[PDB]
Amino acid sequence: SQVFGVARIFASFNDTFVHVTDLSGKETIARVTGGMKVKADRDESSPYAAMLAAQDVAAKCKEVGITAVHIKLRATGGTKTKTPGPGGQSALRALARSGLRIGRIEDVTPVPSXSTRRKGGRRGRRL
Amino acid sequence: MRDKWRKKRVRRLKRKRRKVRARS
Amino acid sequence: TKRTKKVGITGKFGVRYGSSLRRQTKKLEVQQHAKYDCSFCGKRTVQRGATGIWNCKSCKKTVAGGAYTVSTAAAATVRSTIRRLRELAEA
Amino acid sequence: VVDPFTRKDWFDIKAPTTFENRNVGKTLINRSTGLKNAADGLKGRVFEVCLADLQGSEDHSYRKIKLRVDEVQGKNLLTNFHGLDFTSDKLRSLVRKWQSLVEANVTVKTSDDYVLRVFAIAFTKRQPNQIKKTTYAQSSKLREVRKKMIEIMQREVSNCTLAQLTSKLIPEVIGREIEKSTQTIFPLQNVHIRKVKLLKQPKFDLGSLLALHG
Amino acid sequence: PKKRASNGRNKKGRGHVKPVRCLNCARCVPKDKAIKRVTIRNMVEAAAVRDLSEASVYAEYALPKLYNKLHYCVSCAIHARIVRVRSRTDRKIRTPPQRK
Amino acid sequence: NINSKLALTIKSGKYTLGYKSVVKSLRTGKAKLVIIAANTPVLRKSELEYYAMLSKTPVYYFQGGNNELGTVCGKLFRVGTLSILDAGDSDILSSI
Amino acid sequence: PGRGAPLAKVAFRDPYKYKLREETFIANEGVYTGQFIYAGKKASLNVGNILPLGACPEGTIVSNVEEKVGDRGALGRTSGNYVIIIGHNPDENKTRVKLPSGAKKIISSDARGVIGVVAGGGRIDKPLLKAGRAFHKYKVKRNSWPKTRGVAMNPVDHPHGGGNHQHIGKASTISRGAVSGQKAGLIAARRTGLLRGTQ
RNA sequence: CUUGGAUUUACUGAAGACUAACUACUGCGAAAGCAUUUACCAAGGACGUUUUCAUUAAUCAAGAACGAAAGUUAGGGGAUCGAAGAUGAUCAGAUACCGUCGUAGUCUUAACCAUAAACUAUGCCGACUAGGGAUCGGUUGUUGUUCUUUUAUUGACGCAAUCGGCACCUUACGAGAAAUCAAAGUCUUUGGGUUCUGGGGGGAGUAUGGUCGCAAGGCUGAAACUUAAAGGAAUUGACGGAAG
Ligand SMILES: [Zn+2]
């Protein structure tokens, strides 16, 4: 029936990667970022830019033969923040409305079990 | 001035005082 | 009486070679002239021959050790490591 | 300039007979050329599919099994068990405050020399008539739970092969037995095998593969 | 003078507590003093729960939540208005606000 | 536990300290137990336990060296081996 | 003399004629007189025993290790040095080891090594303190002491000699492709100066 | 940094650190501190005690042990962060805050240093004084409770108690300049024992001497001179590039 890939989405506070792989993850079928669709470095992670990045992936997903994608959303993870960026939420909505079908959905933001020192210093970054 | 910096300024001043006495 | 306040065995060097070099010598030359307990006969009669050679006057057992101590830190670590690796492999 | 997806040929994945919905899905690879054979370059891959997909039931939706391909049969991919894991949502859904958490792991080889690290997690159960807020078990008790938890983990894995163990992992026989044997110590809830890791494999036995693939 | 009896933290019968890094500005802050908020949000926005439930190939698929425990320092929390300044008499109250 | 029972035998019962007395006690059959320190030479140990086989005497292998065995007996000197001729108020013979 | 490590004379029996064979080993630390040394494929994992590399588990500390099967020992022979067995690759019969310099090497598993650390370690920790001590050190090694600085010679004697001030004049880093008579200084140096940080 | 394939993807692999969530008005420790498992080692408090010795005690000049971080010396390790330094911005200028790297350091083994808002800014020991409920370890009597196992001599939970704690709520007999305080009460109705410390603000923890330390520095420690104030708690207002 459905030809399942995996839509691996990274949503940072600077960019949004819409990356569709095979079910193994060792074949890149389509990878579109929020920053290839915009002209300002500031909005390159915006929810609107994520919609544009998501829709053209489905266009490439359709022509190859992919008809359904699993969602593996992640944030920056590690020592940095675990909250998903604005792009991942709007890109997730944009995919379902492009005709691409959806199976399992999961968050795979990397989580340390401690961890190394976080950048910024003891007193943080003072703005 | 701040007390911590006044303390540090004296610390660097004492070190100079100690050295200039070493010349004799 | 206490003949020297701090130089100890390095009092044979007088004022030469610098205090830092004399302090490094004192730590190791005390160890290499000390008497250690024999692990074989139990007496405190083990002394250094050349480097790495430690003879016991009583039981005439000679053991290979460190340059200035009968046992070095890394050797004891290896002995426990080998003992551990031995018992796993042979169950 | 080249349209790189021109030489990608799709192969079909097959799950072992220990699993029910054996049609995992499809992949792509550069087609077999003279230099590099697609058969050789596609084995060793790892496929991660939810346990709900390979079993149908929605109760396994929080466990995902990694499937490793070790041999290709023309257009069909023959895989083998590679590991077990929980979903990040589920383990988070289980770790709440005012309750005691106990974890245990152990390394043990199967009947046919499959070295595995099995990870089990359990939590203290709150009584129904309970009044006090916190359900805390003493550290001596949790040592007893963990000590009992490892030996049962060792006993049930070393006595059975991976296929027999995988048939134990589907219904959580070990999870039921861990909770059963810890009843005399402390009431436990949500007793699980939260992870299984393949550490070392022996020489590949293509005969035993087909025995799990027909 | 003394503003609080707890000295702004929750350390009694103790010498030292390992600190935490603020989520926002990565500042070291003691774990007990850090303002901790446990949030459980739906992974998909409430508006998109429908069309993503129509693209689902699985019937009645219970989508997951996102679990996250947040840590803020005093400046992190006050600026983000997670906590607000209270009156001198309202400082004594430590019962949770009744909003949910 | 054994160091306690052995210590009790010292202040209460009969014993001999030293290799020559232990072998001499095994020859006459007056020995009830033989205790050998860990760092006793293997050749001497192996023939101490040969006499015990002939004398029908149990042997206990102390875990410490002749320095620790000596101080258990209340002695300020090394005791490489000892034999208990008469266990006194203690029960070391039935404990071993 | 000339060696910081002690040597152990070990007597073996000749398998084929009635004779005793004396062997000179480098004494591993903890080896004592009268100790039994076992050498072979079936020897147990004990300090001082000689075992093939494949027969040792990972993390085994070994010394006097062979690069080639039957060269009778090449690696880790100075006092306090040893070779760590990093891993095994059994199907091509290979073992990865870590050398005292940090280099990783791949050796045949049939290569042999002596379990333990070379004795005499810590020898460098004590200063020599005296020209006389160095004189006695090299009296039993070779004629390489004392060393005159090349910058202190005349232009005939060294590339660094000459000048109205003692100075090298040109870069002291010399190409690897230089010829004999030119390679005085830092040969084929990838970098110079005080080593800051990790390498 | 990137068409010499960056970022991203999956798997395999190596290093060092750190032990997330559980995690708390919770525990232990003389304090500093202590959070992956297990094994060992030697300690410890509390409770139980119709066991034992009988004043063996409290606080203590002089003198000792330990003592966060940083720093010092010598090896080993050096992933990440990152003083110094270099850098791209911002700015009138910023060699600052922001960004990118980065050396000591961060880790450890041997030794020093002996200081912190080392704070409960509250010496230690002792007795009494007002109510209340939670909670930890022990121990003492008890359930429409589930489980062991089908029940006990299981465990958990539940209800009454007391010991010790870490604390918390109200009140003010009383205290306080007030904030506040169950001790900061039992202090002009002035006396339980004892140690240390202060005598307006600066100069100044400076100079000098001594003493300890490798050094950095620690401990002890003035005077001249100068000044009418410095400061504590709270009230009103004014102001805020704070909240409602
Ligand atoms: Zn001896």
Ligand SMILES: [Zn+2]
């Ligand atoms: Zn801040």
